[PDB]
Short mmCIF file of C-alpha atoms in Angstrom, two decimals:
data_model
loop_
_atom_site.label_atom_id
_atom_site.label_comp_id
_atom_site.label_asym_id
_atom_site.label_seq_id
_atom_site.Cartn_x
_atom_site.Cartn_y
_atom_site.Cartn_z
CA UNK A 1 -17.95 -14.78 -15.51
CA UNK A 2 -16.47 -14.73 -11.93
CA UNK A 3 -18.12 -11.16 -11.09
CA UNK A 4 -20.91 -12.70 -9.86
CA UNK A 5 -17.93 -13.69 -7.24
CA UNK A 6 -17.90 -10.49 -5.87
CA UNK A 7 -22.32 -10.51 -5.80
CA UNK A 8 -23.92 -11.44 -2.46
CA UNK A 9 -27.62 -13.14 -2.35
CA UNK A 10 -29.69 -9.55 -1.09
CA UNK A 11 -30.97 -12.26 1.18
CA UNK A 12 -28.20 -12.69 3.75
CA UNK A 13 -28.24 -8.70 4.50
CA UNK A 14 -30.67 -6.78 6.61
CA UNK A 15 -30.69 -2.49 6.09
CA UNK A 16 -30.84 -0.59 9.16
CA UNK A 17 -30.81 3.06 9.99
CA UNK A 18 -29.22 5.62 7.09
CA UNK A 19 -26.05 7.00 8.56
CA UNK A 20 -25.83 9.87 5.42
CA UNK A 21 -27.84 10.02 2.87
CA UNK A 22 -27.18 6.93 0.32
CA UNK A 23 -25.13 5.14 3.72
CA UNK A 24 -26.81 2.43 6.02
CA UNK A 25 -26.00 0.21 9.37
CA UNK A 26 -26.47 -3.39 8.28
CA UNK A 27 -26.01 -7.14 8.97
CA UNK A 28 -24.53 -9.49 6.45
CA UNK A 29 -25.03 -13.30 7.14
CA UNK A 30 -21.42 -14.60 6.75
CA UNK A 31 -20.49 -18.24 4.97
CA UNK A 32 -19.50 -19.28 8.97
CA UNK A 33 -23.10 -18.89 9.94
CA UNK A 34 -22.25 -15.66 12.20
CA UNK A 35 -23.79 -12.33 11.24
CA UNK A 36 -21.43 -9.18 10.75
CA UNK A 37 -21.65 -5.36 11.16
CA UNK A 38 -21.79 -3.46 8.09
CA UNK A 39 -21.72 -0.48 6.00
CA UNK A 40 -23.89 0.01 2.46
CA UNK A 41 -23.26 2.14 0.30
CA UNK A 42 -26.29 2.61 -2.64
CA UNK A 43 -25.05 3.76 -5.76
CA UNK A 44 -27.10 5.52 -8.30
CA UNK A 45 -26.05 4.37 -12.37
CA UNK A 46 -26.54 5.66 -15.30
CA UNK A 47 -29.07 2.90 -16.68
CA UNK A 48 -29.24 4.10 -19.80
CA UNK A 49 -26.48 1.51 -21.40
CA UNK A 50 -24.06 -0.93 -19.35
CA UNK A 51 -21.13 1.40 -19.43
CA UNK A 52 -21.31 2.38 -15.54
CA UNK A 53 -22.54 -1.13 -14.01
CA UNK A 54 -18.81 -2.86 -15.75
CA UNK A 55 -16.98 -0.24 -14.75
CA UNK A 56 -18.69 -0.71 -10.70
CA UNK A 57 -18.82 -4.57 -11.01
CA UNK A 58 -14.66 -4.62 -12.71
CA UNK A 59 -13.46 -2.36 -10.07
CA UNK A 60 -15.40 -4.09 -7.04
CA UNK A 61 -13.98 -7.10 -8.44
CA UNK A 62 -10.63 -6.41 -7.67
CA UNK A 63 -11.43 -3.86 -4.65
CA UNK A 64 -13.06 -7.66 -2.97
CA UNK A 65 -9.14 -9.27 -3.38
CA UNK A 66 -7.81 -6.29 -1.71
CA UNK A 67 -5.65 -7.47 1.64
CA UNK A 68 -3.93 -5.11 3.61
CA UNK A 69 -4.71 -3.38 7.36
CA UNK A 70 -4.57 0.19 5.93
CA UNK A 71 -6.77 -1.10 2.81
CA UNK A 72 -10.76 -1.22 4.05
CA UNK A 73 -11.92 -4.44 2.79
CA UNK A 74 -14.60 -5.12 0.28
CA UNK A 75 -16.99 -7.91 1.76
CA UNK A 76 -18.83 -8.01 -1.88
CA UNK A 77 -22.03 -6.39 -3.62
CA UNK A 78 -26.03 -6.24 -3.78
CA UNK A 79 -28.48 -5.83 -6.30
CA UNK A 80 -31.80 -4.97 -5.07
CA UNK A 81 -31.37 -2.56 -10.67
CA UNK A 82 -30.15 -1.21 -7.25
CA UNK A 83 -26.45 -2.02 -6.76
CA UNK A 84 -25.20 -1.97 -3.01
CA UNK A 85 -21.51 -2.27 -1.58
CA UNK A 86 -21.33 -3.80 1.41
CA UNK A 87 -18.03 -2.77 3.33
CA UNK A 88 -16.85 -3.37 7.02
CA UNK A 89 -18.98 -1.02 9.82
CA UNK A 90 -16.30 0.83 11.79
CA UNK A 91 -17.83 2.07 15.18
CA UNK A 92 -15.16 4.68 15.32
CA UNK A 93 -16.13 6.16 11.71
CA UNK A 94 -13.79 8.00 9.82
CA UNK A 95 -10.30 9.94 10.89
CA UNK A 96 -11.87 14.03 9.77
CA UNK A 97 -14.73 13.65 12.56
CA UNK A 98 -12.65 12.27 14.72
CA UNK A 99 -9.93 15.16 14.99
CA UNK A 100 -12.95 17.57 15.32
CA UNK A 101 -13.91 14.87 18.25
CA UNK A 102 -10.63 15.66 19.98
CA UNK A 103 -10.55 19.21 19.99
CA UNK A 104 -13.19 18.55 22.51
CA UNK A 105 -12.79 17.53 26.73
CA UNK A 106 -15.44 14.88 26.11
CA UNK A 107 -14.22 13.26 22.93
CA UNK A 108 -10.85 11.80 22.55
CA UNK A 109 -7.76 13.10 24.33
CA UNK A 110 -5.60 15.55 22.77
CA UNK A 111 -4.06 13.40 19.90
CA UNK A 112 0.11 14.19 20.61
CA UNK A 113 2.24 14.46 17.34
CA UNK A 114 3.38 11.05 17.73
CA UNK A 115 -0.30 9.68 17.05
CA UNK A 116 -1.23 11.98 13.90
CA UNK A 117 2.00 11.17 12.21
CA UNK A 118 0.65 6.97 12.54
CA UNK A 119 -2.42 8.00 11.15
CA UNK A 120 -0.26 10.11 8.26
CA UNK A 121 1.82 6.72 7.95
CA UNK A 122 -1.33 3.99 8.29
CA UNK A 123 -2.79 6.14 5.03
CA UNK A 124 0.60 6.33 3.57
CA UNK A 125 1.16 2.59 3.97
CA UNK A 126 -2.34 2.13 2.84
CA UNK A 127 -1.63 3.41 -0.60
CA UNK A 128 1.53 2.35 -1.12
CA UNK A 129 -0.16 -1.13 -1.39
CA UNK A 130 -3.39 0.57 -4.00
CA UNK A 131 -0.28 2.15 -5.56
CA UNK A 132 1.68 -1.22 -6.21
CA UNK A 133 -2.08 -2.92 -7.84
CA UNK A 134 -2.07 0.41 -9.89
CA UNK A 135 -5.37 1.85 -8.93
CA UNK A 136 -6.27 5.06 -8.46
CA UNK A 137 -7.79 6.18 -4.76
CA UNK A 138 -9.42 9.44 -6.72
CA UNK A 139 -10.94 10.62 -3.69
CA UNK A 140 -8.10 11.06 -0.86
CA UNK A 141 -9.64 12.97 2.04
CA UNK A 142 -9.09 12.55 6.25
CA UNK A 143 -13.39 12.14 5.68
CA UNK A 144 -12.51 9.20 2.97
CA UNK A 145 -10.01 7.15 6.28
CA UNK A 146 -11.49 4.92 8.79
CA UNK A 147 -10.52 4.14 11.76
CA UNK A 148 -10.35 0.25 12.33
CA UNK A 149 -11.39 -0.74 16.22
CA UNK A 150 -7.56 -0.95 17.28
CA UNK A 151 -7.51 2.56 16.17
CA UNK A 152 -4.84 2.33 12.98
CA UNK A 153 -6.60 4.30 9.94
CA UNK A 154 -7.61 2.41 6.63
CA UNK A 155 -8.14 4.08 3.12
CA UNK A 156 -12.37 3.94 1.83
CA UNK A 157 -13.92 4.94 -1.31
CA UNK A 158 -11.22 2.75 -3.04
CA UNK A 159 -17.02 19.67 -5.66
CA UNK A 160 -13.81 18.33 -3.82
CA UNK A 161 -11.91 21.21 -5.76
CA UNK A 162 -9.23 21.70 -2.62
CA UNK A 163 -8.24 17.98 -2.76
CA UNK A 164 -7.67 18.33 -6.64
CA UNK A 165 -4.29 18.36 -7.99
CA UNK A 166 -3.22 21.76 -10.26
CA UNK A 167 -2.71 19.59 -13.71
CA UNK A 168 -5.92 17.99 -12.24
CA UNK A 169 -8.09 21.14 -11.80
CA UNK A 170 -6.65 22.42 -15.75
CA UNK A 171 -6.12 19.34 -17.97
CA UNK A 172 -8.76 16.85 -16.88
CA UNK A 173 -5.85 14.07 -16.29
CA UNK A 174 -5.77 12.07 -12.90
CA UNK A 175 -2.36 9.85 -12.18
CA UNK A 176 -1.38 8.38 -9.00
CA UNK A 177 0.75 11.43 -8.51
CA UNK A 178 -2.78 13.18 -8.07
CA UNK A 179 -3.03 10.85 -5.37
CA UNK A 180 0.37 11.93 -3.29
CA UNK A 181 -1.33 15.88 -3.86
CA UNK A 182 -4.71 14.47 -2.42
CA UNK A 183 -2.52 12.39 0.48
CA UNK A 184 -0.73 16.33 1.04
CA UNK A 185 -3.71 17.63 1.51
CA UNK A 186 -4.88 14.69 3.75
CA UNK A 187 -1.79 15.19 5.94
CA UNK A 188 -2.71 18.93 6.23
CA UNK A 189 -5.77 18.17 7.78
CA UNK A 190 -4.69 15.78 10.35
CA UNK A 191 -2.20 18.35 11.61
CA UNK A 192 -4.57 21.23 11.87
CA UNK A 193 -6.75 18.32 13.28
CA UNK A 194 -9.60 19.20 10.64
CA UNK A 195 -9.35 22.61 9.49
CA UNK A 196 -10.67 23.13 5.86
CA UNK A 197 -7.52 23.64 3.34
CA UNK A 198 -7.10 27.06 2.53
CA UNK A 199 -8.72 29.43 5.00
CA UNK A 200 -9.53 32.66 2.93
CA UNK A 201 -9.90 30.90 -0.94
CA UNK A 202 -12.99 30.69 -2.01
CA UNK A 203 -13.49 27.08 -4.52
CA UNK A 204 -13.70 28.73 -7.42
CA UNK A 205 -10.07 30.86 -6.75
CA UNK A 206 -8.52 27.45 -6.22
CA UNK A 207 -6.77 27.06 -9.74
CA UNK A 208 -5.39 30.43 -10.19
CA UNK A 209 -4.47 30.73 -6.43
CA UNK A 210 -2.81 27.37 -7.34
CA UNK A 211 -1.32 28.61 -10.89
CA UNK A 212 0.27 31.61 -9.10
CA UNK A 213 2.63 29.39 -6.96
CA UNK A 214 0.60 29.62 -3.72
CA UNK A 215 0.14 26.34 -1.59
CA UNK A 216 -1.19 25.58 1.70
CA UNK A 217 0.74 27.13 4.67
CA UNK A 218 2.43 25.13 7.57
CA UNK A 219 0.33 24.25 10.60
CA UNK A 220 1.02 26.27 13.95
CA UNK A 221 1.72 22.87 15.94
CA UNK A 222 4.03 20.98 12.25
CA UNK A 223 7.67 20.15 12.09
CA UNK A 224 9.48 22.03 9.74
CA UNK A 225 10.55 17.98 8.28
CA UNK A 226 6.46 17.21 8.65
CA UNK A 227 5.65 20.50 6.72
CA UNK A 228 8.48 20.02 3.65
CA UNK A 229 7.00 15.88 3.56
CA UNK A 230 3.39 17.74 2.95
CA UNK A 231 4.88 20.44 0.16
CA UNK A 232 6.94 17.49 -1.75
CA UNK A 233 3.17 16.20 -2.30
CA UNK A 234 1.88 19.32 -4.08
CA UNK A 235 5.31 20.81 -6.49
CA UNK A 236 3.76 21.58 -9.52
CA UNK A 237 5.58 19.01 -12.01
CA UNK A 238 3.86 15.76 -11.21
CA UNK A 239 6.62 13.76 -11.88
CA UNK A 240 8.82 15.90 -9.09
CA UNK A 241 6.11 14.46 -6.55
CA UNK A 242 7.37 11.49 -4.25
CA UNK A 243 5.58 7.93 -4.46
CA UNK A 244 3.60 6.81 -1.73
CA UNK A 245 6.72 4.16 -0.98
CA UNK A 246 9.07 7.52 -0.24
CA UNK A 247 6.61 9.54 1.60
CA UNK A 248 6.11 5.98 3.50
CA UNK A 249 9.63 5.89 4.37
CA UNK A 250 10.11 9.74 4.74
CA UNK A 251 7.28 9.42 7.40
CA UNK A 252 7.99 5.98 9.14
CA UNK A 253 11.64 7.87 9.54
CA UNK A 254 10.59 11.04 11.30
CA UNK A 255 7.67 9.23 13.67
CA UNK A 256 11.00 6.81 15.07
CA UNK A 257 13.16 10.06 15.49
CA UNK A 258 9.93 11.79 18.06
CA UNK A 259 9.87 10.21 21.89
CA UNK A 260 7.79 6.78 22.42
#
C-alpha cells in the first residue's frame, strides 16, 4: 500500500553516537539534496506474527502527516527486521532535563512563571491538535516534550505508574481523558521544575493512595488558578476531566492575566 510512504531507503541515513540506550545522533539525506540532524529511535517487535510491525507501520503512518509546532514531526521509518524512527534532533533535548538545567547558575536562567506556564500551554496546544486526530499520546511526561530551537515545547513518543490515571492503574482502560491526568501530572513537574510526583509514595502505594482521595499537592512557587487547572486534570470521574481545548483556553487565559 502507501506505508511504504512513510519507509525511508536505510541508505540516505548515517547512525552516530547512542544518546540512551535504543536512541542515536544521525543524518538523514533529505529529497532537496541537504543532509538533516536526527534522532533514531530502534524498536524491538515481537517477530513472532505481524501483529506489532501493523500496528508500528499504521500509527507511523499517520504520526508522518502530523503538522503542528507543538506536534514533533515524523520524518519517516527504517528497516535495517530492525525497524527505526527517524524524528527531528533537538539540540536542546527534552523540557524534564532542562528544568533540572535551570535550577543550576550555569544552565539556564531561573525560568519566571510566565515561561513555565508557555511550556504548560505549547504541550496543551500540542494535544489539543493529537486530541482533534483522536490519538492517544499514552505516554505524557515533561521527559516525553522537546524543546524546538526557538525554545516552544513539542509533544514526542506520539513502570510510569505516577503518570497513570486511577481508572487506568484498576481497569486496564486508556481514553484521552487519561491523557489530561498524564498532562496534570506533566504540569506538576514543570512547576516544581522536575521534582518526581509524589514525594513520600512508594510505586506500588500509588493506586490505593490514589483510591483514598489523595492527589498531588500544590507547588510552593503555583497560583492557586495554576494549582485548581492541574487538579481539574486528575478528579476521579473521567468524564468530569476538562479536554485539552479547555485546559488550552483555561491556560492561554491565566498566562495573558501575569506581567509581559
Amino acid at each position: 500500500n502507501k506505508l511504504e510512504d512513510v519507509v525511508i531507503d536505510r541508505n540516505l541515513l548515517i547512525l552516530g553516537k547512542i544518546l540512551g540506550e535504543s536512541v542515536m545522533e544521525g543524518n538523514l539525506k533529505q529529497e532537496d539534496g541537504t543532509s538533516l540532524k536526527v534522532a533514531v529511535k530502534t524498536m524491538k517487535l515481537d517477530n513472532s506474527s505481524q501483529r506489532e510491525i501493523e500496528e508500528f507501520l499504521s500509527e507511523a503512518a499517520c504520526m508522518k502527516d502530523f503538522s503542528h509546532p507543538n506536534v514533533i514531526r515524523l520524518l519517516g521509518v527504517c528497516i535495517e527486521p530492525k525497524p527505526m524512527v527517524i524524528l527531528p534532533f533537538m539540540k536542546y533535548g527534552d523540557l524534564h532535563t532542562y528544568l533540572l538545567y535551570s535550577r543550576l547558575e550555569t544552565g539556564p536562567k531561573h525560568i519566571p512563571l510566565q515561561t513555565l506556564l508557555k511550556f504548560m500551554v505549547d504541550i496543551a496546544l500540542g494535544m489539543e491538535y493529537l486530541s482533534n486526530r483522536n490519538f492517544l499520546h499514552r505516554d505524557l511526561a515533561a521527559r516525553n516534550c522537546m524543546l524546538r530551537d526557538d525554545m516552544t515545547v513539542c509533544v514526542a513518543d506520539f513502570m510510569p505508574v505516577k503518570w497513570i490515571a486511577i481508572e487506568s492503574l484498576a481497569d486496564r482502560v486508556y481514553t484521552s481523558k487519561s491523557d489530561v491526568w498524564a498532562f496534570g501530572v506533566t504540569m506538576w513537574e514543570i512547576a516544581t521544575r522536575g521534582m518526581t510526583p509524589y514525594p513520600g509514595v512508594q510505586n506500588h502505594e500509588m493506586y490505593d493512595y490514589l483510591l483514598h482521595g489523595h492527589r498531588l499537592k500544590q507547588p510552593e512557587d503555583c497560583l492557586d488558578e495554576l494549582y485548581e487547572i492541574m487538579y481539574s486534570c486528575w478528579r476521579t470521574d473521567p468524564l468530569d476531566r476538562p479536554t485539552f481545548s479547555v485546559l488550552r483556553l483555561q491556560l492561554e487565559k491565566l498566562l495573558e492575566s501575569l506581567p509581559d
